[PDB]
Design a binder for this molecule. Structure first.
Ligand code: HSE
Ligand code: HSE
Lengths: 357, 357
């Protein structure tokens, strides 16, 4: 069978990948070799050991990639490189994977001789898994986005920091909350005071997240004023769909909220033509087996369209669908998706599966 | 001096109003009469007692208003009715107040003989206080909105429920969080399990808010598919600006997040003409003394553009300003504002001040 090396399999994303591969019995169809960066398992920095592998799957990160990758291909190695990190997404000899959406793009690359495949930006991937249909019919002129991103996208320590912040806030008024007759503004003043305290743990986010939000993710790109996270919307959406010749505008604001691992997004989709809502809904629900169209009903929306419902599942609900006041060609849409699955580990697991078949 | 009656002054909004009036020494210029609904202070249901007042300020709510209001005006009473509730906002003989934005609209009404003035929708009011300038120059063709609304808009019990939810989530993994070597996915599984537990207190929101979000606020309006909260965007923005003849489209998705009392909003503003960012920024910052333009810089954004910074203050920061990929006439903007102040108590306090001068 194909000899597959795994790097960064112990990290958070790597861990999800390992769990998903086990659940699906993916290890039965390949010969796994595990690497580590520890000096305390082959060495992740042993080029000769990596050179003997047919495929390398890394969830180690960009710094690792930028270091080892060049060296490895510099030895002639002609194997496949599957990466979760963003390091190589924008390279000419690499393809961004999300097979339920761009399978045809993936297949052509395997023929052109493409040997590098990279998982895509979580936000963009979750968007495409939700409204892939609209793009599948060149029905989208542009999309304005507003995200509600989870701590998992930032990292494990960030998730822990969010949780600690939540605890401290409640702890600040634990007794008052138990007293059904206590003043709410008093409670409010105290939690806000704690949130602003110097001892409030905000080292990882650089600001409070629990009980608040942060309208800024990643570095500023002076060229356009977007953060790198927002920049990936236009850049990655079009490379994934392979439309670098007829790019579809995708822009908006990426905001961090206090959710653990599900990214949510509010959309304003300008459609190229006036179409019936019922038809839009059918097109969306038919693109893939994971997207799930939620009726624009309160009770059902509260049960299905939330991080609480989606966390840890492969389901990608999309709802609140209706026409906007700007015109019958303006579509409103809200979606929730797990950041660690379709937003990270899953696309990686699925391309590997293809490569070892 | 003018005889002013106050109803619902003990509730959350009423409490903020009382505090703000005291801080500003507003009681020195009027003769206050306090009412109550308790049978255990005049009776809030004594029409003859209310009839002798020059002005009535109520934060009691819609049910109260719809009950007492008709009866009072049915006796000939020719005084002013200042209300925080939405009950009468859309009546022909009433004006929605937000003086820093529609003072000229307010003045004309006082002449036409308008005797009813109502505070506006929190989200709409906070939007206008932020980007009032753009509207002040008929520079806005339409605006797509995505909100991050606080629990305070729902009520005191909702704020308490959010806080309780946060505590339980952290409590579910308190020890693991203290252990710097513990597994994050283990932590994740436990908090999510608690969030989904039947004993997780979600009676007030009908769903978990802490650690999640709810893409639905208020009742569904079958006619358009919008929730009443989203509906107020178009309805109230234009009545406040008095443009029911040349309405400006305002639509989007209103989502509840785990914040105590600050509403935040991500905007996609389609401008009528191509203008320089620097000029847009100047126009915005000049509309009123409370709006505050935050440089599109990471460090400053994290310190100024958040519920943590704004909570309990009259400041209305607006930042992340830049042009969108859809074109140089597409503006991106993010704002944060306290829901109980400019979103409720302040506009009420300011119109009262005018009426008693
Ligand atoms: N989607 C994640 C990126 C994952 O690394 C985030 O919002 O940070
Ligand atoms: N702006 C508040 C409405 C206040 O009653 C909310 O978002 O619920």
């Amino acid at each position: 069978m194909k000899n597959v090396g795994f790097i960064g399999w112990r990290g958070m994303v790597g861990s999800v990948l390992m769990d998903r591969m086990s659940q699906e019995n993916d290890f039965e169809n390949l010969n796994p070799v595990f690497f580590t960066t520890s000096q305390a398992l082959k060495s992740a920095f042993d080029i000769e050991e990596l050179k003997k592998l047919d495929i390398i799957v890394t969830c180690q990160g960009g710094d690792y990639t930028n270091e080892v990758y060049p060296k490895l291909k510099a030895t002639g190695w002609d194997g496949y490189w599957v990466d979760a990190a963003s390091a190589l997404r924008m390279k000419d000899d690499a393809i961004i994977v999300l097979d339920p959406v761009n399978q045809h793009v993936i297949s052509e690359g395997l023929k052109k001789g493409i040997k590098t495949f990279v998982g895509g930006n979580s936000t963009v991937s979750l968007m495409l898994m939700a409204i892939g249909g609209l793009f599948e019919k060149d029905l989208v002129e542009w999309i304005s986005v507003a995200t509600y991103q989870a701590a998992s996208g930032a990292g494990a320590k960030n998730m822990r920091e969010l949780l600690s912040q939540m605890g401290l806030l409640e702890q600040a008024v634990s007794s008052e909350l138990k007293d059904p007759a206590s003043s709410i503004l008093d409670i409010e003043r105290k939690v806000t005071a704690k949130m602003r305290a110097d001892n409030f743990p905000t080292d990882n986010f650089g600001a409070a997240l629990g009980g608040s939000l942060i309208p800024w993710i990643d570095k500023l790109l002076p060229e356009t004023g977007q953060t790198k996270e927002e920049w990936k919307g236009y850049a990655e959406t079009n490379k994934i769909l392979g439309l670098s010749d007829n790019p579809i505008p995708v822009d908006g604001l990426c905001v961090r909220i206090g959710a653990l691992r599900c990214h949510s997004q509010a959309f304003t989709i300008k459609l190229k033509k006036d179409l019936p809502l019922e038809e839009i809904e059918q097109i969306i629900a038919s693109h893939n087996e994971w997207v799930k169209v939620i009726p624009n009903d309160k009770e059902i929306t509260l049960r299905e369209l939330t991080p609480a419902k989606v966390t840890g599942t492969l389901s990608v609900p999309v709802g609140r669908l209706r026409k906007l006041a700007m015109g019958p060609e303006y579509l409103a849409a809200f979606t929730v998706g797990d950041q660690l699955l379709w937003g990270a580990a899953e696309p990686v697991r699925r391309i590997l599966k293809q490569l070892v078949a």
